[PDB]
Amino acid sequence: ASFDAHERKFIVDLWAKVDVAQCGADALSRMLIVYPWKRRYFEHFGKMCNAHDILHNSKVQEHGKKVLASFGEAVKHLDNIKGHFANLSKLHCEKFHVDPENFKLLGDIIIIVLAAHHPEDFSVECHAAFQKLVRQVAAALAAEYH
Amino acid sequence: ASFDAHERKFIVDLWAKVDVAQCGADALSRMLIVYPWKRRYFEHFGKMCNAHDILHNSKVQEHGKKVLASFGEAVKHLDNIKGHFANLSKLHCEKFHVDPENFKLLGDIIIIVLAAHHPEDFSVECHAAFQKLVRQVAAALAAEYH
Amino acid sequence: VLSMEDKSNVKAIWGKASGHLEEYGAEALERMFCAYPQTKIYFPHFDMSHNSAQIRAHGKKVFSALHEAVNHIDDLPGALCRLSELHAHSLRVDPVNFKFLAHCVLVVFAIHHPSALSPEIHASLDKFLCAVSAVLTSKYR
Amino acid sequence: VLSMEDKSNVKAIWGKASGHLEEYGAEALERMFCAYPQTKIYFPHFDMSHNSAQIRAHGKKVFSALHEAVNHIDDLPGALCRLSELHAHSLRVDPVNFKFLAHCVLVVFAIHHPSALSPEIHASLDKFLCAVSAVLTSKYR
Numbered sequence A, B: 001a002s003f004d005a006h007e008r009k010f011i012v013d014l015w016a017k018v019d020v021a022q023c024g025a026d027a028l029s030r031m032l033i034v035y036p037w038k039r040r041y042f043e044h045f046g047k048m049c050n051a052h053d054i055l056h057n058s059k060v061q062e063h064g065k066k067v068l069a070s071f072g073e074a075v076k077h078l079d080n081i082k083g084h085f086a087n088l089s090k091l092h093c094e095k096f097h098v099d100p101e102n103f104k105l106l107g108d109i110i111i112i113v114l115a116a117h118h119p120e121d122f123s124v125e126c127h128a129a130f131q132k133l134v135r136q137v138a139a140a141l142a143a144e145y146h
Numbered sequence C, D: 001v002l003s004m005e006d007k008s009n010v011k012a013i014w015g016k017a018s019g020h021l022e023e024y025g026a027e028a029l030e031r032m033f034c035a036y037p038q039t040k041i042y043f044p045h046f047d048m049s050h051n052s053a054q055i056r057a058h059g060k061k062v063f064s065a066l067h068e069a070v071n072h073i074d075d076l077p078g079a080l081c082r083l084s085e086l087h088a089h090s091l092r093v094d095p096v097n098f099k100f101l102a103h104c105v106l107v108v109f110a111i112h113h114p115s116a117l118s119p120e121i122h123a124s125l126d127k128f129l130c131a132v133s134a135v136l137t138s139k140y141r
């Protein structure tokens, strides 16, 4: 459902404060540490045996920056999230073969990374605005899975 | 994704053989026995303490007939499943407050009920056609959840 | 299964909440009610204001229960036996909701203790809240 | 948790498959591959024909493993210890896939033994296949 004016303002004002490179590397690293089966989807990045390996993997760090910058593009397309992500959704399904249940798990990790970097701003109402965003982005990635 | 000619023919030919009243009562009864938290959504049908109570509950039996006849309408709207179910989806979300993860669980039970009543017909390829249908119907019910 | 290291990890991050069970507990429920408003159907009789007496008192009970769980992390089924009957048998809470409250607990720790909730600690805590959730959803019927 | 009655139930429906472990096992995988084609990425080297030598031999191993599980239904973690390391650590099977194969096992019993898989029996069997799945997904990392 559409974001209201108040949802929009929380989202738009928080995201202008976000360091996308540092939070993206953080979010991607944590998802491979918390849910270790996801490592199989990235077996081409190399060293992913333990959490030290992951935290020190330059390709994991780099990739996290792109994933979050992509996600960040939802903030300019709040009215059109499903349409904006439709090609990516295809790419995940066909080329990377990723089970769509995993998108919801990354979205939760992103909430936790944002909460830790922006505690004064990540209020109860702000957190509800972002949870709705993350639910829409995960749904738009899963949408072209046929 | 669209059903091909072969998917369509499996589906359309099986469903003409189905006893919708008996399979619907069967499917609804089993879902309340296998996943007992679902009983909370129907606390207005009465006696749902044990499985004997459920199997003997006339309102549960009756309701199962409607749910399956509804589902059966997908077979005449294969090209338009998400559009056909959009109001029902609303009704589930707003009026009955049902968590959308539960639609996938009913769909699996329906596969098991059909398999048991039509074993010679429920081949490997037929079962794959029906699994795709059930995945689309569960998705169309969850779709208006905002 | 929780390793010995997971267990050290959970105990140590848990100790940060020691004086703040009501505070952290109340904040987690506030977050669960606001971010997953479908959870409100289980508390029809609650005042849903910020820092409501009813929410403060329930937030305390929840986190007090999670605090004994940490103190009995070897025997979670026995520590949470009565709770599992309440949630699954008497209240018929749909098992999806345990994931929502677990996520909100994690958000509270990240806000209050961002350095302590490192990635490997984050992994242990999440293992412990799945383990607690599994015990509470173990008794349906 | 599996009650005493669930356990009687699982043993009795399991006995119907006793002479048909390869047959039923092969059919369940055929069904999982066809109805959930995303599961095929784990078996790149398999011949995916009907009644393929490779599928018959793997269907047997799976159902033979599930048969010892039934025979040790009190101690599933110990019965499936080595399998849990293979699946979670060495193969990194995404945990959604265990639900797909469990559903296909249930479909095979419904086809071959429709009267025996009554609703209360159906509930016990489904509890046992969730329990087996939980052990096999218990060792990630």
Ligand code: HEM
Pocket: A038, A041, A042, A063, A066, A067, A068, A070, A071, A088, A091, A092, A096, A098, A102, A103, A106, A107, A137, A141
């Ligand atoms: C917010 C959710 C997500 C977004 C926005 C996202 C975005 C992206 C983007 C932008 C790429 C690069 C596409 C390109 O190569 O041009 C990508 C690649 C990829 N994504 Fe995702 N992704 C998300 C979730 C996930 C999840 C949950 C997984 C796995 C568990 C995953 C696995 C992959 C893999 C394997 C690649 C290919 C990596 C490579 O070969 O470099 N993604 N994703």
Ligand code: HEM
Pocket: B038, B041, B042, B063, B066, B067, B068, B070, B071, B088, B091, B092, B096, B098, B102, B103, B106, B107, B137, B141
């Ligand atoms: C194939 C999936 C489903 C279909 C086609 C379906 C269809 C229906 C239909 C046609 C009704 C009657 C609507 C009316 O009153 O006009 C209904 C009502 C209802 N459904 Fe569903 N349903 C499905 C799944 C579920 C699931 C999984 C649950 C709960 C776990 C559920 C809970 C309810 C409840 C509580 C009602 C209201 C019952 C009453 O007050 O009589 N449904 N559904």
Ligand code: HEM
Pocket: C039, C042, C043, C061, C062, C063, C065, C066, C083, C086, C087, C091, C093, C097, C098, C101, C132, C133, C136
């Ligand atoms: C970590 C997970 C949870 C723990 C540790 C927990 C703990 C508790 C405790 C200690 C009580 C009080 C029991 C008593 O006073 O005897 C309780 C009651 C209750 N819990 Fe939970 N709970 C959890 C998850 C949930 C969830 C997810 C829901 C619903 C979405 C929920 C709904 C309830 C309800 C409705 C009550 C009745 C409260 C009342 O009387 O107002 N709980 N829980």
Ligand code: HEM
Pocket: D039, D042, D043, D061, D062, D063, D065, D066, D083, D086, D087, D091, D093, D097, D098, D101, D132, D133, D136
């Ligand atoms: C009831 C659940 C399951 C049981 C009881 C089971 C049992 C087994 C057994 C007994 C083996 C042979 C191990 C050996 O020879 O030492 C095996 C191997 C394997 N299993 Fe499973 N398994 C199950 C679920 C799954 C699922 C869901 C997948 C993937 C979707 C899977 C993928 C594999 C793969 C890829 C192998 C390697 C087989 C090969 O060498 O070709 N298993 N499993």
